Curated annotation (Swiss-Prot), chains A, B:
Name of the protein described by the UniProt record: Copper transport protein ATOX1
Claim: Ligase is one of the keywords in the record: no
Source organism phylogeny: Eukaryota, Metazoa, Chordata, Craniata, Vertebrata
PANTHER family linked to this entry: COPPER TRANSPORT PROTEIN ATOX1
Subunit structure: Homodimer. Interacts with ATP7B. Interacts with ATP7A. Interacts (via dimer form) with SLC31A1 (via C-terminal domain); this interaction improves ATOX1 stability and controls intracellular Cu(I) levels.
GO molecular function: ATPase binding; copper chaperone activity; copper ion binding; copper-dependent protein binding; cuprous ion binding; metallochaperone activity
Binding residue positions for Cu cation: C12, C15
Superkingdom to which the source organism belongs: Eukaryota
Length: 68, 68
C-alpha cells in the first residue's frame, strides 16, 4: 500500500475531471486531487513508472513529489 | 490530406494546450484548436481510429463530427 504524491499542472475543474477519468481507467488505485495546489496523491501497488506514464497521458506537465 | 473534425470538451487554455501536446507526440499532423466552440480539426494520413484513440486517452469527452 505505498503512498505516492505527484505534481500535475491542472488549471480548471475540467482538468481535474480528466485526471480522474484516466486513473479510473487504469484501476487498482485510491486517489485524492487538490486542484488549487496542483497535487495528486495515489495509494496503489502499481509501480511509480506506471503511475507516472498514466498521468502523462492527459497531456499535462507531471513531476514526482515522493513517497509519504 | 484528409481533414477530420472532432468535438472535444475543453474548458480553459490549459485544456487546449494539453490537446496540442498529445497530437505533437503522435506526429504527422496539422491541426487547428478552437476553444470557445470546443472543436479540433486535423489533417493527417493517420487512421480515424488512431486519431480518435489519441484524443480519448487524454481523459476528455470526445466525439467524431465528420470527414472531408
Ligand atoms: O472553467 C471552465 C468553465 O466553467 C464555468 C462554468 O461552466 O465557470 C465556472 O468555473 C470557473 C473556474 O474557471 C469559475 O471562475 C466560474 O465562476 C464558475 O462559474 C465557465 O464559465 C467556464 O468557461
Ligand atoms: O488556432 U486557429 O484559427
Ligand atoms: Hg482546463
Amino acid at each position: 500500500m505505498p503512498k505516492h504524491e505527484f505534481s500535475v499542472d491542472m488549471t480548471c475543474g475540467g482538468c481535474a475531471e480528466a485526471v480522474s477519468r484516466v486513473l479510473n481507467k487504469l484501476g487498482g488505485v485510491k486517489y485524492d486531487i487538490d486542484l488549487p495546489n496542483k497535487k495528486v496523491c495515489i495509494e496503489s501497488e502499481h509501480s511509480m513508472d506506471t503511475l507516472l506514464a498514466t498521468l502523462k497521458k492527459t497531456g499535462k506537465t507531471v513531476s514526482y513529489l515522493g513517497l509519504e
